[PDB]
Amino acid sequence: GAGPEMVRGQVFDVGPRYTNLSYIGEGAYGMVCSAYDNVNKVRVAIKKISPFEHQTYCQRTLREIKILLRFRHENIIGINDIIRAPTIEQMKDVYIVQDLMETDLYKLLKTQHLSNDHICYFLYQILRGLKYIHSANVLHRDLKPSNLLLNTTCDLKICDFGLARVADPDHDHTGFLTEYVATRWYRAPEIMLNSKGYTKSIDIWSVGCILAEMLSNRPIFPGKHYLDQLNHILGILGSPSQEDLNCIINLKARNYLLSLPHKNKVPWNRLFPNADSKALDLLDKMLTFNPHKRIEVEQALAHPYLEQYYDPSDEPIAEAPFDDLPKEKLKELIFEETARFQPG
Numbered sequence: 374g375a376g377p378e379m380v381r382g383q384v385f386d387v388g389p390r391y392t393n394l395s396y397i398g399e400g401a402y403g404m405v406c407s408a409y410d411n412v413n414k415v416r417v418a419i420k421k422i423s424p425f426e427h428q429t430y431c432q433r434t435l436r437e438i439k440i441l442l443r444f445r446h447e448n449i450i451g452i453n454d455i456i457r458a459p460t461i462e463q464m465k466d467v468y469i470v471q472d473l474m475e476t477d478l479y480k481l482l483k484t485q486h487l488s489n490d491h492i493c494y495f496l497y498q499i500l501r502g503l504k505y506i507h508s509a510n511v512l513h514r515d516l517k518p519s520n521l522l523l524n525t526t527c528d529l530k531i532c533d534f535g536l537a538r539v540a541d542p543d544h545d546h547t548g549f550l551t552e553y554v555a556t557r558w559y560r561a562p563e564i565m566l567n568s569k570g571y572t573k574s575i576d577i578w579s580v581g582c583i584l585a586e587m588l589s590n591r592p593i594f595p596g597k598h599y600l601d602q603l604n605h606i607l608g609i610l611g612s613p614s615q616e617d618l619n620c621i622i623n624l625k626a627r628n629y630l631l632s633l634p635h636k637n638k639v640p641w642n643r644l645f646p647n648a649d650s651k652a653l654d655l656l657d658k659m660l661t662f663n664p665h666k667r668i669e670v671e672q673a674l675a676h677p678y679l680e681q682y683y684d685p686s687d688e689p690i691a692e693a694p695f696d697d698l699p700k701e702k703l704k705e706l707i708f709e710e711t712a713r714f715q716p717g
């Protein structure tokens with residue numbers, strides 16, 4: 374006989390297939406470990422999910438499961454296996470089995486200086502992954518260094534699709550200071566002004582912020598609270614032009630911007646004196662105030678900075694485009710979506 378494996382006073386019950394566990398880290402509702410896969414004879418990553426108590430955990434779990442099982446791309450993390458009980462009644466936790474990566478960009482940026490060739494390659498793979506996501510009419514909505522995994526040879530995979538949504542550009546408008554879910558430092562200016570984050574331009578902003586942080590090892594706009602985030606953006610971009618204010622029809626939002634003193638643009642090359650001039654030209658185009666003028670993913674890939682990698686024939690798209698449900702229907706939905714990994 375035998376008993377289930379334990380990590381730090383936690384059931385991490387993945388055996389007999391997955392053994393020899395090491396703690397990696399965690400989040401709000403999951404411990405993450407590596408484990409030796411006895412079938413494929415490789416170490417893998419396993420994330421323990423326990424979402425059946427909160428309906429926002431269930432929504433987020435299901436959304437990501439569905440997206441990652443549909444998606445297939447070298448720059449997007451997949452799901453290799455899902456472990457759960459054979460019945461709904463006995464199902465308490467779900468384990469998601471994924472390729473084991475060495476680290477993430479957040480950890481790498483706190484410890485390592487990136488050469489220009491590393492920055493270039495990382496940015497290429499982010500955008501290549503993002504082209505596929507956007508081609509499926511999906512928005513990631515939470516791109517940040519900790520959601521970018523790296524292997525030992527610096528190949529990059531996008532993870533964490535829990536906040537992802539289908540794009541909805543005609544329902545993007547909202548009022549001033551609308552509360553938002555995604556990570557503050559990577560939030561586009563429009564979120565704080567008049568946007569629900571339903572357009573592809575929201576992810577490009579986040580990629581711009583990540584590019585800036587790769588250049589200096591420091592987040593470019595570290596806001597300490599909701600409206601501070603906009604202070605930081607305007608601090609570097611300067612005051613919006615008359616033309617860009619004219620696109621902001623909502624009066625509360627517009628008049629807030631008109632109330633502020635004039636701020637000068639901080640030149641990119643002053644902020645980043647050792648950066649490649651082409652990297653700073655692309656940065657400028659991704660961190661454009663006005664989301665309609667902001668560069669799109671496919672244009673970013675065609676930018677001179679990425680000419681060593683750019684190859685649209687090797688940058689694939691999705692074959693096709695990709696609520697009020699209680700906890701019990703969401704549990705049934707999660708059970709159903711994970712059925713393909715069961716023995717029999």
Ligand SMILES: Cc1cnc(Nc2cnn(C)c2C)nc1
Pocket residue numbers: 397405418450471472473474475476477480522532
């Ligand atoms: C899904 C997933 C999550 N994490 C990893 N690896 C990782 C990240 N940080 N560290 C220290 C390690 C070992 N691999 C895959």
